[PDB]
Write a protein that binds this ligand. Structure first.
Ligand SMILES: Cc1cc(Oc2ccccc2)c(C(C)C)cc1-c1cc(C(=O)O)c2cc(F)ccc2n1
Ligand SMILES: Cc1cc2nc3c(=O)[nH]c(=O)nc-3n(C[C@H](O)[C@H](O)[C@H](O)COP(=O)(O)O)c2cc1C
Ligand SMILES: CCCCCCCCCC[N+](C)(C)CCCS(=O)(=O)[O-]
Ligand SMILES: O=C(O)c1cc(=O)[nH]c(=O)[nH]1
Length: 356
């Protein structure tokens, strides 16, 4: 299957369908379990004391509305992140709003937080809440990424609503700094927002109390990164997700659509994300777990992020080019590399470039 998807089926499908139509179909195929279905003990990771069967997750934006979670576990992901979910439903930007850059192994998107909204997602997750508890117990956690509505004037209150409504259904919640596709996205205001989010989380009953992570852009200044690291440590934010898509356009992009507005993902992002992880790990003294994301398509890509300071990784864009078999490929390849490089497991490699 790995070669067949990569060389034949996915290229052919790219030809037939626009990428958004393809995404919609993929979410329906995955929700139906139209996939084949052990991970090595080497791949197990405990992050904040909680088990992950393997360190490879699906990034936010694939299953925006929580429709395909079980199918994603079936695909081999060690954890699933849904969202972003906004408090009220919203349509997002006009179509077309997703663009392939095949020559670059990249995508540009400007979805604009299209979302079924908190209530719909809440009911979807409730339908399977106990099943998720068992999965989480078995090493397959669920994350929920929270957004804000386009027309909201109080961003903190949108995020607070999301904590209250979906927090009780989540292992972890994510607050983005960092969508490029919502207008408006100092350190005192960042602190204010996060304090409110944490206070809401802290108010949930313990069985229903998620971790809270902040997801950042690759496009931050050095000052912004220092400031985030400082706030995260001061408030005791649980983790970081590093990174979202980039609004930069690195030199050398070849795709005809390179100058479309949106966030760029895939291969062109990869090393910018890895370098962001490396910086955030250093700034937080290795004490804050990082989920590393951006341009992971192989075991080497994953290990590079882990060795830079990621405890876990996610991928999305690689699926669009390689299909579902990429998940197994990344995990087999990572296991092989860890052995070659002398690591006992994933855990031993975390932050190794820094010297621990
Ligand atoms: C990731 C993916 C997998 C797919 O195939 C399967 C999905 C589930 C089960 C079996 C096959 C298919 C099919 C059904 C055409 C499409 C995709 C897919 C493709 C594309 C694409 O660019 O063609 C895509 C683009 C996005 F921006 C976001 C998600 C996307 N997902
Ligand atoms: C089509 C698409 C939609 C996305 N939507 C979201 C989103 O809703 N929330 C979010 O936090 N990140 C979103 N992302 C960003 C991804 O979660 C991820 O951070 C980024 O694409 C880099 O990983 P990748 O290079 O493996 O795709 C989206 C990415 C893509 C490609
Ligand atoms: C930081 C990277 C993600 C770390 C994953 C943390 C998962 C934690 C939440 C689990 N649930 C069940 C929601 C609450 C248990 C609270 S506890 O019992 O005090 O551990
Ligand atoms: O447009 C979106 O919905 C979206 C795109 C993206 O790249 N990142 C994100 O956080 N949201």
């Amino acid at each position: 299957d790995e070669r067949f998807y990569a060389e034949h089926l996915m290229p052919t499908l790219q030809g037939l369908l626009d990428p958004e139509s393809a995404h919609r179909l993929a979410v329906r195929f995955t929700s139906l379990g139209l996939l084949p279905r052990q991970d090595s003990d080497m791949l197990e990771v405990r992050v904040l004391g909680h088990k992950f069967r393997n360190p490879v997750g699906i990034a936010a934006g694939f299953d925006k509305h929580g429709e395909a979670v079980d199918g994603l576990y079936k695909m081999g992901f060690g954890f699933v992140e849904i969202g972003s979910v906004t408090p009220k439903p919203q349509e997002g930007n006009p179509r077309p709003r997703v663009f392939r850059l095949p020559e670059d192994q990249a995508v540009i998107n400007r979805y604009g937080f299209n979302s079924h909204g908190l209530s719909v997602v809440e009911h979807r997750l409730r339908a399977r809440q106990q099943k998720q508890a068992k999965l989480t117990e078995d090493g397959l956690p669920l994350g929920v990424n929270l957004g804000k509505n386009k027309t909201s004037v109080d961003a903190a209150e949108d995020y607070a609503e999301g904590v209250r409504v979906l927090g009780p259904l989540a292992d972890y919640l994510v607050v983005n700094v960092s969508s490029p596709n919502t207008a408006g996205l100092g350190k005192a205001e960042l602190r204010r927002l996060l304090t409110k989010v944490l206070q809401e989380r802290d108010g949930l009953r313990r069985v229903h109390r998620p971790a809270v992570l902040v997801k950042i852009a690759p496009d931050l200044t050095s000052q912004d990164k220092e400031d985030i690291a400082s706030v995260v440590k001061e408030l005791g934010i649980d983790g970081l997700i590093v990174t979202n898509t980039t609004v930069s356009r690195p030199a050398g992009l070849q795709g005809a659509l390179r100058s479309e507005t949106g966030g760029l993902s895939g291969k062109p992002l990869r090393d910018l994300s890895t370098q962001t992880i490396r910086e955030m790990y250093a700034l937080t003294q290795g004490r804050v777990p990082i989920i590393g994301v951006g341009g992971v398509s192989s075991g080497q890509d994953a290990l590079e992020k882990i060795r830079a300071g990621a405890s876990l990784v996610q991928l999305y864009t690689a699926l669009t080019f390689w299909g579902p078999p990429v998940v197994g490929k990344v995990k087999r390849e990572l296991e092989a590399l860890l052995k070659e490089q002398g690591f006992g497991g994933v855990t031993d490699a975390i932050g190794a470039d820094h010297r621990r």
